[PDB]
Design a protein around this ligand. Structure first.
Ligand SMILES: CC[N+](C)(C)NCCC(=O)O
Ligand SMILES: CC[N+](C)(C)NCCC(=O)O
Ligand SMILES: O=C(O)CNC(=O)C(=O)O
Ligand SMILES: O=C(O)CNC(=O)C(=O)O
Ligand SMILES: NCCCCCCN
Ligand SMILES: NCCCCCCN
Ligand SMILES: [Zn+2]
Ligand SMILES: [Zn+2]
Ligand SMILES: [Zn+2]
Ligand SMILES: [Zn+2]
Ligand SMILES: [Zn+2]
Ligand SMILES: [Zn+2]
Ligand SMILES: [Zn+2]
Ligand SMILES: [Zn+2]
Lengths: 384, 384
């Protein structure tokens, strides 16, 4: 009833098509949009699922010259004698009503978000199951998107496990630190992460204008002397900050902070960026946190009078993150892999003791959210 | 005179340090910023050039307890007995005056831009020279940044040349189309670029939320039947559009357009994004164009009444690009490589004739602007 055509007609000087569906709901489709989206072989390359029609070929003042229909299709003639057919189900999906557009956006981008604090139950799946079964890999990426973190247990205690997960997703995101990288204490460390020091809450790689969307960390070796993990839900924290200190939120969401990374690893590098620590979309919603206190530059590109208020705001944000109601602490064992949203979560590590042998070794990698989302879309289709 | 300290003192309840330089100019440094940027080994990891000091350790209401100085250094005691030394040259560079901050930003990000239209003289360098000499690679990337395109002549007519340029920069940007990819007519083409068809002005890969910053295209084989290249300076075009049709500019700079790419190449993919075609920074300056008419989705997530005005605006933008005063046309020969800013330029190709043998073959790749800028910073240092 809902996707069967009861009537189709051209309206508004023939600039709109109206469909009355068999449930009595109506949908409206601008003529210019219909013409732009003609699925014929002249206009559309089926092997690519892509538009061949050029903007230059589109008459933006076009109207429908003739229309007939049956229950499942509309058949249109255009003023220049071009001819198009549209399927009812295809039309129904693309209905310009707010409800229809919103449903479809939800299907494309999986916006469902579950905020959490210290009560978090760490979502956990088996490593080999995720590699082997689409049902398990689907639960993995869907939960990663919704909650922001999934622990995978039962991987080996040798290098190469993150690279498997990389292939399962698609491919990993190369940076100056390598295709994958080893978190261990290193002589002449090129990064604070490669020491035994504490890492306070941070996101990885704000020195890039497009920080890694997803991070993977695999525990090869763990130390008993410290090195526990800590995470916080940055979107939850930002919401709390906006309520408790709107001025602190305003400053952190509007001030461009410079980040820097200079050194040598996979290649020699001298990297500089600017980010707002709390990054909002055009509707004021938080979409990314960009903050690593190690790589925040000494250079600070703001008028003098804005400096101390910035630091006061940063301090409030960091104190919120550290609150016992916000943070979740846990410890990785060998064979554990954590995979998390590096745009939303902030993560940290407790200091541990240095010594002559390597007491602690994680292998890590990054993936682009678009690569992850692509796999998520494909997995959903295969599982449903 | 300019970087020699004549006087240093604590002011404003000791919350600011003022330096009077030997040229009689004054600079001001907030105490909290000084403390945050203590270069001692407790606060700062020299091997990493990174801050160890945590936000949690920073008293945002800190003032200077004591200060002495000589011509080249200031020596500060803090209320908790921490002790810091700062060098005059380091201070001078980081002066919070608008002039000093702006100079430094120019040094970090190379903002100099030369807009062009059909009068463009295509900047051209030798391929092997760029691989061999830092002077030539510096001219390459600096010109790429400033003008938006450089042609390199005298490469071979075999695959593997873009990969050399990749290593010269650092590394290339992997996508679903491969580490590098072959632009040729293909049976069951997964993309319109892999056909003999015309490509209208576009940017590459708006189906990604972070499109490739820099594109490389190397001509292995060229056809006499068509396949000329065309480019336009998108920042120049946007400026013209803002003047001729502010409403068209407003629409294209505020409307989120959906892009899509589904298929199989390096991996299987189902990619979706949203972009504003004219993407502005927080000051209203154009920073990226996101537009490929082939990969613009059939899905269009806007209220019905906004649809036809969007298309009318797009048409005006495309007509401007196509204007004889804006576009620059040229033809690649075997051994030519073009390298260009895929955020600023739009590029295209003329159709050519299909046949039984391959008549036309380019090898292409992408690089991230941050990777390119890093090399540019290093090269400038080595050359100066
Ligand atoms: C590359 C992995 N590593 C060193 C753990 N982190 C890089 C990101 C960062 O320093 O912010
Ligand atoms: C990957 C290279 N290729 C096919 C030439 N272009 C991809 C970007 C695009 O379709 O917009
Ligand atoms: O070592 C850990 O537990 C966590 N490491 C990091 O956050 C890092 O390397 O960026
Ligand atoms: O084939 C050409 O001349 C140019 N190709 C493209 O713009 C492309 O493949 O994206
Ligand atoms: N069911 C209607 C089919 C119309 C075909 C028209 C071809 N020009
Ligand atoms: N030139 C002044 C040196 C001061 C050293 C102080 C160490 N606490
Ligand atoms: Zn139906
Ligand atoms: Zn058609
Ligand atoms: Zn980290
Ligand atoms: Zn290298
Ligand atoms: Zn000096
Ligand atoms: Zn110190
Ligand atoms: Zn292209
Ligand atoms: Zn694959």
């Amino acid at each position: 009833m809902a996707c069967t055509i009861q009537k189709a007609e051209a309206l508004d000087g023939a600039h709109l098509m109206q469909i009355l569906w068999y449930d009595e709901e109506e949908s409206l489709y601008p003529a210019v949009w219909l013409r732009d989206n003609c699925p014929c072989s002249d206009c559309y390359l089926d092997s690519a699922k892509a538009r061949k029609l050029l903007v230059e070929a589109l008459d933006v003042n076009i109207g429908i010259k003739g229309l007939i229909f049956d229950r499942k299709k509309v058949y249109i003639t255009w003023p220049d004698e071009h001819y198009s057919e549209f399927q009812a189900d295809w039309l129904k999906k693309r209905c310009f009503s707010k409800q229809a557009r919103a449903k479809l956006q939800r299907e494309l981008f999986f916006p469902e978000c579950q905020y959490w604090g210290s009560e978090l139950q760490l979502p956990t799946l088996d490593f080999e199951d995720v590699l082997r079964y689409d049902e398990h890999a689907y639960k993995w990426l869907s939960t990663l998107k919704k909650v922001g973190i999934v622990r995978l247990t039962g991987a080996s205690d040798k290098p190469g496990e993150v690279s498997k997960l990389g292939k399962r997703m698609g491919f990993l995101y190369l940076t100056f630190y390598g295709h994958t990288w080893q978190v261990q204490d290193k002589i002449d460390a090129n990064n604070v992460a490669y020491t035994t020091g504490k890492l306070s809450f941070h996101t990885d790689y704000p020195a890039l204008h497009h920080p890694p969307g997803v991070q993977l960390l695999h525990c090869i070796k763990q130390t008993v002397t410290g090195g526990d993990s800590e995470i916080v839900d940055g979107f939850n924290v930002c919401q709390k900050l906006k309520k408790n200190n709107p001025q602190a939120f305003q400053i952190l969401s509007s001030t461009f902070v410079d980040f820097t990374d200079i050194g040598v690893d996979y290649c020699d590098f001298s990297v500089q960026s600017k980010h707002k620590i709390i990054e909002l979309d055009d509707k004021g919603q938080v979409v990314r946190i960009n903050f690593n206190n190690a790589t925040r530059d000494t250079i600070f590109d703001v008028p003098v009078e804005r400096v101390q208020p910035f630091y006061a705001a940063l301090k409030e944000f960091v104190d919120l993150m550290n609150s016992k109601e916000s943070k979740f602490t846990f410890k990785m064992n060998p064979g554990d892999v954590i995979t998390f949203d590096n745009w939303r979560l902030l993560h940290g590590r407790r200091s541990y003791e240095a010594g002559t042998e390597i007491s602690r070794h994680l292998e890590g990698a990054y993936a682009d959210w678009d690569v992850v989302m692509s796999r998520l879309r494909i997995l959903r289709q295969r599982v449903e």
